[PDB]
Design a protein around this nucleic acid. Sequence first.
RNA 1: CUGCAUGGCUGUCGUCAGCUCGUGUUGUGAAAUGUUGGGUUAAGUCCCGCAACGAGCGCAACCCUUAUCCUUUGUUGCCAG
RNA 2: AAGGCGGCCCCCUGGACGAAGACUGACGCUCAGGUGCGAAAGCGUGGGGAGCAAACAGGAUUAGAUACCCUGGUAGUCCACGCCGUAAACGAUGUCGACUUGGAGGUUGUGCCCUUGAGGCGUGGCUUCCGGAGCUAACGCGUUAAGUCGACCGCCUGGGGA
Lengths: 70, 225, 156, 67
Amino acid sequence: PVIKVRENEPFDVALRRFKRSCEKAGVLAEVRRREFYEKPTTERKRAKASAVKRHAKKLARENARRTRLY
Amino acid sequence: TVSMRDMLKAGVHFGHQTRYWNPKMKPFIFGARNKVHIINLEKTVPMFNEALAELNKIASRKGKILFVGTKRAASEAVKDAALSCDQFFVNHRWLGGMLTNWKTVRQSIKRLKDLETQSQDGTFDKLTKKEALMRTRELEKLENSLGGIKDMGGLPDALFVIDADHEHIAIKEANNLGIPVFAIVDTNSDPDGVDFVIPGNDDAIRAVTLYLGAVAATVREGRSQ
Amino acid sequence: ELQEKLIAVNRVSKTVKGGRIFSFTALTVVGDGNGRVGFGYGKAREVPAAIQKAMEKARRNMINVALNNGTLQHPVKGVHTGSRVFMQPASEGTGIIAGGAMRAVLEVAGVHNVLAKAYGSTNPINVVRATIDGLENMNSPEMVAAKRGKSVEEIL
Amino acid sequence: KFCRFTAEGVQEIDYKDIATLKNYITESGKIVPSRITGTRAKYQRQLARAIKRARYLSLLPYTDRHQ
RNA sequence: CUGCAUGGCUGUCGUCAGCUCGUGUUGUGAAAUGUUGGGUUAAGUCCCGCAACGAGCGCAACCCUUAUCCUUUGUUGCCAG
RNA sequence: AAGGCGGCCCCCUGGACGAAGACUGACGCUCAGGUGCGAAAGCGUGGGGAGCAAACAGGAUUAGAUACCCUGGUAGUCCACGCCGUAAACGAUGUCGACUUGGAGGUUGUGCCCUUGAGGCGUGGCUUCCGGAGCUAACGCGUUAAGUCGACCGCCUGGGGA
Ligand SMILES: [Mg+2]
Ligand SMILES: [Mg+2]
Ligand SMILES: [Mg+2]
Ligand SMILES: [Mg+2]
Ligand SMILES: [Mg+2]
Ligand SMILES: [Mg+2]
Ligand SMILES: [Mg+2]
């Protein structure tokens, strides 16, 4: 991403904008999974393990609204 | 009275959302309305009248009717109506084993007899004020939970449940003992643990006021024999 | 008054941080020579306390059986978790031809002539429940006539 | 949000449109996921094909950097 | 001599906070609940919810001094006047 | 169908689902023996080979390490034509038909109402999570059942030996 800083802009805010752009692009987070070979078996296992937790959280959110006042 | 017009004007016909309806109580459904169920007055009124007839008959039989309800909106009502009909009530959370573990209920009943007589005996003298106020709270909070069943003797002869779905444990205990039950069930309740089924709304100030006004009146109705 | 027989006593034990602790479980069956019969399962630290605890629960859980004058009405089968009991009526003088925990429960239920056979796991704890459920589910001529609308003479 | 294609009754999506299609690609040339766009699964699979067609025909860059 | 026969006594874990029982309930059963979960505390201390309800040894208090004030008695002590 | 399939385009083609129809008329289910397909690894011939990587060498750890940590590295993984029918080939749940409370979704089509906004009511196919009766030794299944039955095939009879 091009983060060419214009005039009258502090280096601090310029670097923060660059870091935010990198974070929203998610380039740094992709190397931690592209650094090694994940077998298709392992990838599918991770995907289902993440899907199971992803609606289990919503299931618990919608189920904890019945009892347990505080 | 038993008036369907009174029930409709109070708001008994309302129920709960259609996603919580119990599948075993649909004959008592008038039809969905904005994802909210509506009960049947044409079916609620006759069953309620028959239950009131049986209740006043069993009251003339000199039976100990116990009201039980832990709702916060109908908290003071089930007490002001139980005092009117000269009967017994439980208003706080149902202590599991109140009916089955009657030996320990009587033991607690006598604990809050010795402690009750402590107030008369001015025994708040053989101990300083910290001792005295601790004992004062020990009766205050011990009475505010089981005070409606102090002068009751043994097990009640009939039960009247404000909401069967919430107080399902009391339904089970009463069925195990062999005590007749008149429970106010709703669209999300289970009308299978009760021999007498009372359809209609269960969480409404006006609805519970009408129910209590009918029950207490018929109980005094039967007592005056 | 009422007759009672305890069938088997066990020596179940638990394990704790400081070792293993012991306990006793007693199975008893109570009856009165008639259709009333019940079973109880008490748990205590010693055999007399266990049997005395089981007796009270048996008495409070007694159930009624529509037996005949000296036998049962019709052959029946009872299916529990691990026990499959099959009982059938017999004639005068045959006796109670049953084994395991079924003999005691039949004797306290009052049936004098009966032939019983158990298949599966013959443990007393399960076979007692199996035979109690089989005896409680049997029908009588009067009950079947009432439920069908016919008469006992018609359905003979 | 809501599927604007269904809201406006857009039956088909053509790669030749760029002014109203750039809204579905990030500044890095990556496709905005459905969980962020608010688009149905019927039209996400057609938006992806249109974006791929535009990338092939040099209408939308694959990424910010190419050379 | 034998604390590898013991009584009595003592130290540590540790004034750490847990250790159990009665009834009831649940599971065919071994067994579980109570004792778990949120707040809170020094704590199984208190509350709420929850088939749990209660009880014992238990966490505190009741025991001994200090900290404001009252009365009684005034010697071997105080000198307000 | 299973195994398994992921930029885009072109050509051939199999299968699946829906409103309203028309048409033959039991032509329907299963199926020993047989036939075909069938992960990867492996073998033969002809090619290619960037990266990865059995065997192999070296380095490191360890009392020892013919291994896990590292640097290389051939077969192989890439293509065409041939051989095997082997997997935890799993949903450890065979194929087909009917019935049995409910809730919250995903995907796909259609009907209707004023569609002013994925407004509202219905209706079929696939699929996902709870959950009642019931079943089970219990975990658990639970309208896609492991609930009750019907038709058929295959398999099981103590653990080793095997
Ligand atoms: Mg807590
Ligand atoms: Mg291969
Ligand atoms: Mg290597
Ligand atoms: Mg080496
Ligand atoms: Mg298999
Ligand atoms: Mg076939
Ligand atoms: Mg389920």
